[PDB]
Amino acid sequence: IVGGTSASAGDFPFIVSISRNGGPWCGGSLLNANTVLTAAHCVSGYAQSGFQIRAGSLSRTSGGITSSLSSVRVHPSYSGNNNDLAILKLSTSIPSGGNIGYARLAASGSDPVAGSSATVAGWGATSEGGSSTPVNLLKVTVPIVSRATCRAQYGTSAITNQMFCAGVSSGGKDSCQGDSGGPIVDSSNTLIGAVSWGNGCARPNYSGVYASVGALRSFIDTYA
């Protein structure tokens, strides 16, 4: 997260860190006791055994409850950056309670309204290309950018109806590498997307691009 502030305990009860080979890698969202939603690109085709989920902590490396993975399912239409969601099943079930909870999802067919406020969180870099990552979870609030504007930045074909965009024209507030797969919520803390891709991090006039939960609810609901 670029331009972020520390998340408080209980801000995102459903957020999980996803380590790979013992190191930082991405984020995700706990949907129920045995299911995490993350970005497909975080997991597709990689050795499953390399991943460890941690829930209930502001840190990636201690606290809370961990699990390995039992299975990985990418969206059936995942291609390039498009449809960038995956369902992970956990080897160890994680109960709600305390600072752990399960995500409430954006309604099927919803699309974040341009200008509305969204909050994204993760353990990724704090600058483009940064090599260090924070120990504790960061968050940042950015407005939704219209898809039309987003297509003017990236190209018409590049932004699909399964993506939405968020950021500030000036730059300086965004998700970044290591935040992929983690949650972006609306102002009510409902899960509206997963961190997916973008042109660098926090650049002027290149929004962050998010996999849209509202658009991808059929997949999520079928396999959660």
Report d(CA 160, CA 130) in Å as an integer.
Answer: 29
Number of domains in the chain: 2
Q: Which residues pair with 2 in a beta bridge?
A: 174
- Do 67 and 33 have their domain in common? yes
Q: Are 71 and 53 contacting, i.e. CB atoms less than 8 angstroms apart?
A: no
Both tokens of 48, joined, read: 């499953």
**Amino acid at site 55:** A
- Domain of 171, CATH number, reads 2.40.10.10
* Size of the chain, expressed as the number of residues it contains: 224
- Do 47 and 122 have their domain in common? no
Experimentally, how was this structure solved? X-ray
- Do 33 and 119 have their domain in common? no
Parallel/antiparallel/unpaired status of strands 65-67 and 86-90: unpaired
Report d(CA 210, CA 176) in Å as an integer.
Answer: 12
- Do 46 and 147 have their domain in common? no
Domain of residue 142 covers 1-12+103-214
Please confirm, yes or no, whether 41 is among the known catalytic residues: yes
Three-state SS for 43? Answer: helix
- Do 110 and 209 have their domain in common? yes
- Do 84 and 107 have their domain in common? no
Resolution of this model in Å is 1.0
**Dihedral pair phi/psi, residue 114, rounded to 5°:** -55, 135
- Do 164 and 223 have their domain in common? no
Q: Are 193 and 173 contacting, i.e. CB atoms less than 8 angstroms apart?
A: no
- Do 2 and 92 have their domain in common? no
Which residue of the set 19, 41, 57, 207 is catalytic? Answer: 41
Q: Are 102 and 14 contacting, i.e. CB atoms less than 8 angstroms apart?
A: yes
3-state helix, strand, coil in the chain (%, to 5): 10, 40, 55
Which residue of the set 180, 196, 207, 212 is catalytic? Answer: 180
Please confirm, yes or no, whether 75 is among the known catalytic residues: no
DSSP collapsed to 3 states, 182-205: CEEEECCCCEEEEEEECCCCCCCC
**Dihedral pair phi/psi, residue 43, rounded to 5°:** -130, -25
